[PDB]
Amino acid sequence: VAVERVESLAKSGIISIPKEYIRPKEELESINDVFLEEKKEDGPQVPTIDLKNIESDDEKIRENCIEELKKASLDWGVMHLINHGIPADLMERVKKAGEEFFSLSVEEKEKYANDQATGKIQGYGSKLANNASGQLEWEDYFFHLAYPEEKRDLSIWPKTPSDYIEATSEYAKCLRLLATKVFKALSVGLGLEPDRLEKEVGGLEELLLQMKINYYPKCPQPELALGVEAHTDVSALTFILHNMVPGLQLFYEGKWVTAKCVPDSIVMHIGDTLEILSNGKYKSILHRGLVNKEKVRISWAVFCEPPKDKIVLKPLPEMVSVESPAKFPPRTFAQHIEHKLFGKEQ
Ligand SMILES: O=C1c2c(O)cc(O)cc2O[C@@H](c2ccc(O)c(O)c2)[C@@H]1O
Numbered sequence: 286v287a288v289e290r291v292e293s294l295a296k297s298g299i300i301s302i303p304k305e306y307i308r309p310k311e312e313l314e315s316i317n318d319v320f321l322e323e324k325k326e327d328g329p330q331v332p333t334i335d336l337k338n339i340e341s342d343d344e345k346i347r348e349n350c351i352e353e354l355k356k357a358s359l360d361w362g363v364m365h366l367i368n369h370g371i372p373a374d375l376m377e378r379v380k381k382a383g384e385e386f387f388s389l390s391v392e393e394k395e396k397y398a399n400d401q402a403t404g405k406i407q408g409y410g411s412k413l414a415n416n417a418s419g420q421l422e423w424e425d426y427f428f429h430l431a432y433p434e435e436k437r438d439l440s441i442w443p444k445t446p447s448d449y450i451e452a453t454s455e456y457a458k459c460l461r462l463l464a465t466k467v468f469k470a471l472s473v474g475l476g477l478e479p480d481r482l483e484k485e486v487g488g489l490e491e492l493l494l495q496m497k498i499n500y501y502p503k504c505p506q507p508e509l510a511l512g513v514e515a516h517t518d519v520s521a522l523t524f525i526l527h528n529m530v531p532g533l534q535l536f537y538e539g540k541w542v543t544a545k546c547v548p549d550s551i552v553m554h555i556g557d558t559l560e561i562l563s564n565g566k567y568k569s570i571l572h573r574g575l576v577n578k579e580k581v582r583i584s585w586a587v588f589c590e591p592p593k594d595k596i597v598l599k600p601l602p603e604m605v606s607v608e609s610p611a612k613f614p615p616r617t618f619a620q621h622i623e624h625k626l627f628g629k630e631q
């Protein structure tokens with residue numbers, strides 16, 4: 286087998302992209318210039334949610350915050366979080382370190398190469414074709430478990446820069462605390478006890494935080510390919526950071542909306558796991574990512590997942606009634622992923 290990285294392809298000189306990266310004719314029609322889309326101020330826009338008072342002593346003020354978070358989650362399922370409590374400089378250090386790692390040569394990064402054939406899913410890689418179509422996406426990435434600390438495999442974490450492990454582990458610790466706050470506000474919104482949702486996804490013991498760094502090289506024909514294909518996140522919650530280069534688009538009310546860059550904010554996605562548990566109340570939105578020919582785009586996504594086999598996911602009893610039948614059958618995290626993959630393959 287040959288090992289092809291998109292970064293190498295982007296530097297091979299080619300002025301035209303391989304056939305494997307061109308989307309189907311029907312899909313190409315919806316792809317435009319990400320820079321112009323970013324400028325449009327008409328139509329629905331991704332909501333910005335302020336979490337300053339999410340845990341305020343003032344009852345009226347606290348409830349107003351919880352209510353705004355609830356509404357955005359029921360409608361969009363995605364949002365720009367501000368006043369989230371995570372130090373701005375810590376985030377700068379995480380991004381700087383990621384940029385230094387991907388700044389190394391491909392040959393150097395290959396020393397961290399993953400190997401799916403033997404179950405080694407953590408490390409440097411690029412998505413391999415997994416079905417008849419043979420479609421490929423314009424991106425490389427690095428994936429690894431970031432929390433709980435005792436479950437980590439530090440041996441595969443970048444050794445360059447020297448502070449990658451230190452900054453990434455502290456950031457992971459901060460996100461874990463923020464997740465607990467979001468889970469409580471969301472529980473209360475559904476009329477459940479404060480600790481209900483986080484408990485159903487594994488609690489402090491079983492809940493996992495996976496880190497995926499997405500690297501999108503410049504593309505010579507940006508309107509024929511996608512950085513990431515259209516999909517919904519299978520996680521409970523997803524927290525993302527980026528390098529102020531536009532690219533994320535959301536499929537809202539039948540149309541692809543382009544997300545704007547909001548300084549010091551953190552994008553949060555409601556994932557399939559919470560959508561299933563709430564029987565469809567909280568939305569797991571369809572989204573994708575565009576590439577361009579002028580700037581390299583990078584993003585840092587942290588997926589909060591429940592144990593893959595230990596828990597059977599299904600609508601909670603309180604969310605199901607004769608008038609509101611279950612919208613999803615019972616399945617584990619692993620079985621859910623397999624079902625989604627089985628869909629496209631078929
Ligand atoms: O490789 C993958 C993957 C993985 O290696 C480890 C893990 O813990 C979760 C994962 O999730 C998969 C997935 C599949 C379909 C989706 O719609 C989606 O959002 C995510 C993904 O393919």
Ligand SMILES: O=C1c2c(O)cc(O)cc2O[C@H](c2ccc(O)c(O)c2)[C@H]1O
Pocket residue numbers: 406410411412428495497517518519520588589590
């Ligand atoms: O969307 C994604 C995703 C998600 O939504 C939820 C989740 O819990 C894990 C995830 O991880 C995906 C992934 C991991 C390793 C890979 O090698 C890869 O190609 C893809 C990512 O794509």
Ligand SMILES: O=C(O)CCC(=O)C(=O)O
Pocket residue numbers: 497499513518525527532533572573574583584586
């Ligand atoms: O790069 C982004 O904005 C997000 C990519 C994405 O959807 C994912 O990694 O699941």
Ligand SMILES: [Fe+3]
Pocket residue numbers: 516517518572
């Ligand atoms: Fe996603």
